């Protein structure tokens, strides 16, 4: 918690709470200037609650006095915390205007609304007059700058607490909060700036949940020693496909090759295996003889033999989901002593007891529907539920990659959030590519967690590099964009 | 005094002294970043005294911790004021290193020296170890950033107190200080940034001594109504020249015309009057018949007749200085009921009783040699002596324009400092141009003080627009550059 970090910074380091509050407010002023240009032509409406978020607002309002066209504070609380009171007091000594009633037509006379109503740790549903004011600000068309978190977002979850401010700019302090990172909060945050307000860098660094950044991914990318050969860069087996789903294997395989893997082999039911090499002849696509077009226990021994000469096995994309696939998948993973990347239909039939028993590592890559089915909960209970994902990862000894617009990657100890990507990834085939990427990076020497971190980022970044409208992005185009994402990362 | 402004801001407005100190120090960090780029590659040596300047230094050092390559504070004082002590305490709690001995070789290990040794209001000559340290920093070749004022400059006068830091960058608070504006201090200041640290804008504005800025000159420049004629823009008489000094009249006259004056007439001894129209035939150059090539009382009545049909009279450039010139100048000014711009040899022969008796206004434009002779003091007693200039202006009911690299313009109530210009103005003819400019602006409707303010600025700015090396600038080239200075001002 930043709440804890503020407390330690005040109580143990001895920084006056007022100094933190001053730094917070001036950082909002500087951020607005960076975004709007010269502030002197704008009229500012500052909405202050009674808490320290409001206190930060009074500092903003006071620092705009005499410099901008007009400033008014509407004070919406009933009582003020000590730092809010002190800064209210300064704003008034400096000649500032405060009113305590919100008049709908007051929005008419201002260009920018500074939302300092509620901050982090707000827990209750907003109703009554706070709601009305927030709804009026949202309909007003004005530029909205939110102090810390848009008022009405739960800063621990990203949920809207009945209603919430939609900001053009949010200025937060120290670190991004979970509510900036997860949706809907991420959407309501608008452009996010993270200000340094003077916390010791050691406390800022102690946070155990992180946003995955370019710099983090660049320092995890494996080295490519010049004197190398394909085995230097690992070997992947991908067990995938069926008579129903012949495309999945192809997309996973190329996903491994595009991130620099040395050798990729697919095991796919004949004749669907032939689809992959007609499209990308650099793939090895082994024909697996099946009774009805789906993997079954009769293919167990062939798949374990194929496994011996690879570094990692991805399983699941397009396998189908029937009882014989279920038997095969669970018996295979129980016997495979290689890292496993488990996706799609391998998740749908997975017996989670098998994961506890494995000595080798695993990465699971469910979307929330798949996660929901796996732990027997509703999609709504699991979506963006990073604590559930952490517990699952810790209990089953795996890395969990819970896919959504913000993807969560956790091994139960460390949790990372991915924010790259766009809606073109919301389309069949996208996940199959990511599964290949993750396997590939594990094969090249990254840990399951590192492989997942780099892969989710690059998969999202590749999507963003599509030249045309994102809704026209397809998995095949995404594959083409991977090596550009890699080059841009460096 | 800013000292007073800090006190009122703390004691009457209620801003915690620590909040002012925090804002000061972070403003230094931001300024250095603007100048150096990313700070993370630099090692910083911060030299802190015991006073609040040192306190500001501790804030700088503390805010660099964990962000830059290395930070060390050398604490040079013997005791610490309360805010310095508090910020020393924070720097140490944050993990910062302080030593109390300055080792000459310590400069070897750092890229930037932050000079927070002494601030404003230092009064005594620096000797002993402070001097040695300051001299070592000056020989070191490192980048030097001075907090408030370079240590060793007297912030009220700009004098060096035995020795002083030579800064690449100085970051001051609220307003520039006199010691940044006057030399040598102006030279030692290097690039000056003035930070807003949260004083009420009303107190910042109450300062009665100002630097002349572009924006101030732009808002004083007269209007040019389209439906106008030459009389709209005034008429100047310039009484100037002699058989010895035939060029002066020409340069003064064109100086009036280049700033937009409608009509300019010169009165110059025949045949030297003919020099002016051979060079600029738009001038009227009236031949004055003299006995020996110099104005005398025999020309009094002609000059007073010529005066009736003008708005302003400039007198002095190249008149010569002998007894008959003295009689003429004093009798003329005692009788002339028009504004007078008094320069050069008219200053040298001026009886200051005559100025007290005049009902009409005057501007005097001495360089320090001329000022020294006028009040019977040494050049050293008068140079940059803004209090003497104010008293003189107040006592004699005039505007005094005391020329030097920083020019002082005062009517005894308001005092303005000009910082435009370069060394190409240190050459004969330069002053003659300025005298014409001032007269011209008075003729166009500006007050003597306004006319002087706009003229010193534009005269200096024109010099800066010379395309080649400044030492090759001549008065004739300066005249050519005036209308460009004007266009650039708009």
């Amino acid at each position: 918690h930043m709440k804890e970090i503020d407390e330690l910074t005040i109580k143990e380091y001895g920084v006056d709470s007022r100094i933190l509050m001053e730094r917070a407010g001036i950082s909002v002023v500087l951020a607005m200037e960076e975004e709007l240009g010269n502030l002197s032509d704008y009229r500012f409406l500052v909405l202050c609650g009674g808490g320290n978020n409001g206190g930060d607002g009074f500092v903003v309002a006071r620092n705009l006095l005499g410099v901008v066209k007009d400033v008014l504070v509407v004070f919406l609380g009933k009582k003020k915390t000590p730092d809010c009171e002190y800064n209210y007091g300064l704003y008034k000594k400096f000649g500032g205007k405060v009113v305590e009633q919100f008049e709908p037509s007051i929005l008419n006379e201002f260009d920018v609304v500074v939302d300092a109503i509620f901050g982090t740790g707000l827990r209750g549903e907003i109703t009554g007059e706070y709601a009305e004011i927030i709804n009026l600000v949202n309909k007003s068309g004005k530029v909205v700058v939110s102090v810390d978190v848009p008022s009405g977002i739960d800063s621990n979850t990203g949920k809207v607490l009945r209603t919430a401010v939609k900001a053009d700019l949010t200025v937060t302090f120290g670190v991004p909060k979970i509510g900036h990172i997860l949706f809907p909060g991420r959407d309501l945050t608008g452009k996010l700036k993270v200000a340094n307000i003077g916390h010791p860098v050691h406390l800022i660094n102690s946070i155990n949940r992180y946003v995955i950044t370019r710099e983090m991914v660049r320092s995890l990318l494996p080295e490519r020693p010049r004197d190398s050969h394909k085995g230097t860069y690992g070997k992947v087996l991908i067990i995938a496909g069926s008579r129903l789903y012949s495309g999945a294997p192809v997309l996973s395989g190329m996903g491994s090759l595009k991130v620099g893997t040395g050798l990729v082999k697919l095991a796919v039911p004949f004749p669907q295996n032939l689809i992959a090499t007609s499209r990308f002849p650099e793939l090895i696509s082994v024909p697996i003889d099946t009774e009805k077009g789906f993997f079954s226990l009769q293919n167990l021994q062939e798949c374990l033999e194929l496994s011996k000469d690879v570094d990692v096995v991805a399983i699941g994309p397009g396998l189908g989901n029937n009882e014989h696939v279920r038997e095969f998948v669970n018996e295979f993973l129980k016997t495979l002593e290689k890292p496993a990347v488990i996706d799609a239909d391998a998740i749908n039939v997975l017996d989670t007891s098998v994961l506890k028993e494995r000595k080798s590592p695993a990465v699971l890559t469910p979307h929330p529907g798949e996660m929901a089915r796996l732990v027997k909960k509703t999609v709504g209970d699991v979506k963006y539920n990073y604590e559930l994902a952490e517990e699952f990862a810790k209990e089953n000894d795996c890395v969990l990659v819970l896919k959504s617009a913000t993807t969560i990657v956790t091994d139960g100890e460390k949790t990372l959030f991915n924010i790259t990507g766009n809606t073109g990834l919301s389309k069949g085939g996208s996940g199959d590519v990511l599964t290949g990427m993750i396997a590939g990076f594990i094969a090249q020497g990254l840990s399951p967690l590192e492989a997942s971190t780099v892969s989710v980022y690059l998969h999202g970044f590749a999507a963003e590099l599509f030249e045309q409208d994102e809704r026209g992005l397809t998995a095949s185009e995404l594959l083409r964009l991977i090596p550009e994402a890699i080059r841009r990362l460096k | 005094h800013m000292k007073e402004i800090d006190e009122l801001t703390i004691k009457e407005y209620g801003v915690d002294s620590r909040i002012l100190m925090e804002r000061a120090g972070i403003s230094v960090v931001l300024a250095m970043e603007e100048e150096l780029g990313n700070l993370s590659d630099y090692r910083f040596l911060v030299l802190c005294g015991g006073g609040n300047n040192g306190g500001d230094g501790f804030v700088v050092a503390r805010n660099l911790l964990g962000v830059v390559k290395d930070v060390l504070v050398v604490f040079l004082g013997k005791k610490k004021t309360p805010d310095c002590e508090y910020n020393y305490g924070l720097y140490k709690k944050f993990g910062g290193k302080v030593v109390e001995q300055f080792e000459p070789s310590i400069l070897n290990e750092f890229d930037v020296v932050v000079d927070a040794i002494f601030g404003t209001g230092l009064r005594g000559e620096i000797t002993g170890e402070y001097a040695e340290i300051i001299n070592l920093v000056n020989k070191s070749g490192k980048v030097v950033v001075s907090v408030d004022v370079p240590s060793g400059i007297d912030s009220n006068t700009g004098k060096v107190l035995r020795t002083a830091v030579k800064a690449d960058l100085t970051v001051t608070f609220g307003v520039p200080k006199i010691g940044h504006i006057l030399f040598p201090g102006r030279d030692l200041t290097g690039k000056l940034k003035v930070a807003n640290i949260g004083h009420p804008v009303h107190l910042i504005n109450s300062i009665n001594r100002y630097v002349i800025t572009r924006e101030m000159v732009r808002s004083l420049l007269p209007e040019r109504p389209r439906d106008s004629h030459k009389g709209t823009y005034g008429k100047v008489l310039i009484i100037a020249g002699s058989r010895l000094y035939s060029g002066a009249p020409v340069l003064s006259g064109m100086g009036s015309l280049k700033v937009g004056t409608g009509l300019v007439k010169l009165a110059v001894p025949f045949p030297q009057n003919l020099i002016a129209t051979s060079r600029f035939p738009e001038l009227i150059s009236v031949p004055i018949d003299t006995e020996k090539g110099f104005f005398s009382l025999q020309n009094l009545q002609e000059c007073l007749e010529l005066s009736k049909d003008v708005d302003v009279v400039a007198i002095g450039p190249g008149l010569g200085n002998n007894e008959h010139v003295r009689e003429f100048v004093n009798e003329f000014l005692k009788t002339l009921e028009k504004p007078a711009v008094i320069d050069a040899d008219a200053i040298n022969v001026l009886d200051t009783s005559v100025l007290k008796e005049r009902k009409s206004p005057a501007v005097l434009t001495p360089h320090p040699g001329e000022m020294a002779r006028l009040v019977k003091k040494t050049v050293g007693d008068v140079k940059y002596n803004y209090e003497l200039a104010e008293e003189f202006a107040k006592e004699n009911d005039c505007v005094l324009v005391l020329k030097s690299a920083t020019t002082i313009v005062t009517d005894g109530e308001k005092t303005l400092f000009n910082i435009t210009g370069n060394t190409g103005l240190s050459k004969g003819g330069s002053g003659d141009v300025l005298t014409g400019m001032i007269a011209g602006f008075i003729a166009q409707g500006l007050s003597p003080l306004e006319a002087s303010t706009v003229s010193v600025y534009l005269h200096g700015f024109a010099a800066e627009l010379f395309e080649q090396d400044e030492r090759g600038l001549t008065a004739s080239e300066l005249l050519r550059l005036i209308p460009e200075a004007i266009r650039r001002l708009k």
Partner: peptide
């Protein structure tokens, strides 16, 4: 970068 992460 001293003040803001963006």
């Amino acid at each position: 970068a001293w003040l803001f992460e963006a």
